[PDB]
């Protein structure tokens, strides 16, 4: 079974977990806890990784790091990255537009100045969300009628910004519908209700936003 | 002919420019100068872009944004993204490892405390560069004998960190060699002496590091 290694947090790997659960792929999750930073440091250069980091993905055929390389590899092995340069580029464009939101959060979540930085991020967020709302006015999922890895990336981003402001999706009914649609996929619904789901933290435990042992 | 739209800076699109010149592709670059933000705002939503942003790339088949979608599309049109999931994932892993460096710079380059933040980045930089130095010990380019788009991404990142610290590659002879090897590619050599080459700025003009109209 492939091994997925990461901290016991959502962070960079949550979209990858959602994709694996949608595919019903068996995988072995190797998780590092809040106080296991030393265990990681003693294993980091002992795994055969060319660019040692978390997350990592090991399946015998490959030893990968970089969260986007890993999610794309899993999608690629299941023939989901797109059928021609045009479709593959549309999927990569969706990826990058989601990362603008998700890194917008992570960039400020460890700052002691978070409560002021959050205000600026939430003022810029609507312009980004509007582009996805428009994209979803004619399509069921981000790439049309079938699920692609960016849909799970967007789901993760929406989950995270709703912790920052539970009202930030009120002006975007298509995004509220999209989020409920992902949750209604049978594999996802079972996963999210199960003990396998990691609901918290969103970032590292030391983060000012999305850290700690429990949601506030 | 394809149109590439961006600010008249290196920024997010320099590796794409290098790739297009390496491939000897015909393209038109439409640049926005320091005082042309109004020009961009007047056409941002009139170009048919689904996720309007800079850079944009428009050809007869696609209207793209997101700098990484654009570079991947150009590579994909020339069959350079990788021959199997394993090779495509290694190229994506190299991408992400370069972006760790390049965004490490951009994250701090606009801060008025750049002089203090720089120190931490330059402290982390050697262990990031060491992974590339090791990769080039057994391969000519990052993916082997042939150039891939991550090679031009790495070139761009080395050019930028050398402005931050001229000595930061002194401990990495293979990276010093790699930078000169890219500059020796005849298409790149000619590009660097052409009217199209943008030598400065590295970031937006308003950046504390890599901004202004000329280098320090
Ligand atoms: O601040 C950022 O840090 C990053 C990284 O440190 C990185 O390794 C990759 C990325 C990336 O791919 O996309 C990004 C964005 O679209 C964005 O708006 C901000 C950031 C990043 C980013
Ligand atoms: N660009 C990399 C970033 C990886 C990263 O920053 N990982 C953090 C956790 S979110 C870490 O703890 N890395 C372990 C290390 O550097 O030793 C990716 O997307 O995978
Ligand atoms: N993740 C996006 C970031 C794009 C971005 O931030 N572009 C800046 C310049 S570096 C911009 O000026 N966008 C114009 C706008 O937002 O209207 C990418 O890689 O292309
Ligand atoms: Cl705590
Ligand atoms: Cl100036
Ligand atoms: Na706590
Ligand atoms: Na100046």
UniProtKB/Swiss-Prot annotation, chains A, B:
- GO terms assigned for molecular function: glutathione transferase activity
Q: Does the keyword Membrane apply?
A: no
* GST N-terminal domain mapped to chain residues: 1-82
Q: Which InterPro entries match?
A: Glutathione-S-Trfase_C-like, Glutathione-S-Trfase_C_sf, Glutathione_S-Trfase, Glutathione_S-Trfase_N, GST_C, GST_superfamily, Thioredoxin-like_sf
Would I find Transferase among this entry's keywords? Answer: yes
Q: Which residues form the GST C-terminal domain?
A: 84-202
List the EC numbers from the record: 2.5.1.18
Q: Name one GO biological process term.
A: glutathione metabolic process
List the catalytic activities from the record. RX + glutathione = an S-substituted glutathione + a halide anion + H(+)
Q: Which residues bind glutathione?
A: 6-7, 40-44, 53-54, 66-67
Record function comment: Conjugation of reduced glutathione to a wide number of exogenous and endogenous hydrophobic electrophiles.
Provide the family line.
Answer: Belongs to the GST superfamily. Mu family.
Q: Summarize the subunit comment.
A: Homodimer.
Q: What is this protein called in UniProt?
A: Glutathione S-transferase class-mu 26 kDa isozyme
């Amino acid at each position: 079974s492939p091994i997925l290694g990461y901290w016991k947090i959502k962070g960079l790997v949550q979209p990858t977990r959602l994709l694996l659960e949608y595919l019903e792929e068996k995988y072995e999750e190797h998780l590092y806890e809040r106080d296991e930073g030393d265990k990681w440091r003693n294993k980091k250069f002992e795994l055969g990784l060319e660019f040692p980091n978390l997350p990592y993905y090991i399946d015998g055929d490959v030893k990968l790091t970089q969260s986007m390389a890993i999610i794309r590899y899993i999608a690629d092995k299941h023939n989901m990255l797109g059928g021609c340069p045009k479709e593959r580029a549309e999927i990569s464009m969706l990826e990058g537009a989601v990362l603008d939101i998700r890194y917008g959060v992570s960039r400020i979540a460890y700052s002691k100045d978070f409560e002021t930085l959050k205000v600026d991020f939430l003022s810029k967020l609507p312009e980004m969300l509007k582009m996805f709302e428009d994209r979803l006015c004619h399509k069921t999922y981000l790439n049309g009628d079938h699920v692609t890895h960016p849909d799970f990336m967007l789901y993760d981003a929406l989950d995270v910004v709703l912790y920052m402001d539970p009202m930030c999706l009120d002006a975007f009914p298509k995004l509220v519908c999209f989020k409920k649609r992902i949750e209604a996929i049978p594999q996802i619904d079972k996963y999210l209700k199960s003990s396998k789901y990691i609901a918290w933290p969103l970032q590292g435990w030391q983060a000012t936003f999305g850290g700690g042992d429990h949601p506030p």
